[PDB]
Design a protein around this ligand. Structure first.
Ligand SMILES: Cc1cccc(-n2nc(C(C)(C)C)cc2NC(=O)Nc2ccc(Nc3ncnc4ccc(N)cc34)cc2)c1
Length: 261
């Protein structure tokens, strides 16, 4: 009954983009011209209303850097329709075919954009809770919008959050820090060699990932700020954003392309 609603014939489903649990996700077309992402609910796997809270959140949160809702079909069988992103998941992009051509100049820009999506979230007093490369869509021209696949993310989760449920925009900040290391190691799992329980323990003793190879000390220092023990000493997304946009003039003016970054 809202103006997001569309006829069922406007949507063609072409390629299965992955069977999740509660339904499928499909690439396809809306009104026969527009490449579209389509989210299916398998009737009686989930309260309709509850599948549709996803669409409700994406109505309030609108930004050039957030994944964008286009339309809904809201009566069973339900469809949720959002913009297609040609490159898919950041994480697969980082570790696949484009992997090897990305350099520091492209990765900082991707991070610049994510921060920026995250700044809109900061301004809206929303909280992501699972910020990380698996939850970023990439599009044409290295465009990166913040997203959530519904998708235990402990290695990316601020300790106050993994320990005491204290999830805030500051614990999102901490994941951004980890996300930066996925960006700078081209998709590698952080804390290589460690396992969930030894991450919780060593991180609480103050251990942090060291500078990845070929990564400028100043980007790693930015990481290190994101990973301060105290939620409040962590930077805002507005700092992170401004800093990354300006990186190559203000912090690495002398920067020189290497084998991998
Ligand atoms: C579970 C849930 C519940 C409530 C809200 C959400 N949110 N929340 C957000 C924020 C907070 C950022 C606004 C976003 C979502 N939902 C969301 O991101 N949904 C969504 C929908 C489809 C996709 N999948 C693909 N999309 C677009 N192209 C592709 C191209 C390739 C491919 N493989 C997959 C895709 C990913 C995410 C999510």
């Amino acid at each position: 009954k809202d103006a997001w609603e569309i006829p069922r014939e406007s949507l063609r489903l072409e390629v299965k983009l992955g069977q999740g649990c509660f339904g499928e996700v499909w690439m396809g077309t809306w009104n026969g011209t527009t490449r579209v992402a389509i989210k299916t609910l398998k009737p009686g796997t989930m309260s309709p209303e509850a599948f549709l809270q996803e669409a409700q959140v994406m109505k309030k949160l609108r930004h050039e850097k957030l994944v964008q809702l286009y339309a809904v079909v809201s009566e069973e069988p339900i469809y949720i329709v959002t913009e297609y992103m040609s490159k898919g998941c950041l994480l697969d992009f980082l570790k696949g075919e484009m992997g090897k051509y990305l350099r520091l100049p492209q990765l900082v820009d991707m991070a610049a954009q994510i921060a920026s999506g995250m700044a809109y979230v900061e301004r809206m007093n929303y909280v992501h809770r699972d910020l990380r490369a698996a939850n970023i869509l990439v599009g044409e021209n290295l465009v990166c919008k913040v997203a959530d696949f519904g998708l235990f993310p402990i290695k990316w989760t601020a300790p106050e959050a993994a320990l005491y449920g204290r999830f805030t925009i500051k614990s999102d900040v901490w994941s951004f820090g980890i996300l930066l290391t996925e960006l700078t190691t081209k998709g590698r799992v952080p804390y290589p060699g460690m396992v969930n329980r030894e991450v919780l323990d060593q991180v609480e003793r103050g251990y942090r990932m060291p500078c990845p190879p070929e990564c400028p000390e100043s980007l790693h220092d930015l990481m290190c700020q994101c990973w301060r023990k105290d939620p409040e000493e962590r930077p805002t997304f507005e700092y992170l954003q401004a800093f990354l946009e300006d990186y190559f003039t203000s912090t690495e003016p002398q920067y020189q392309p290497g084998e991998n970054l």
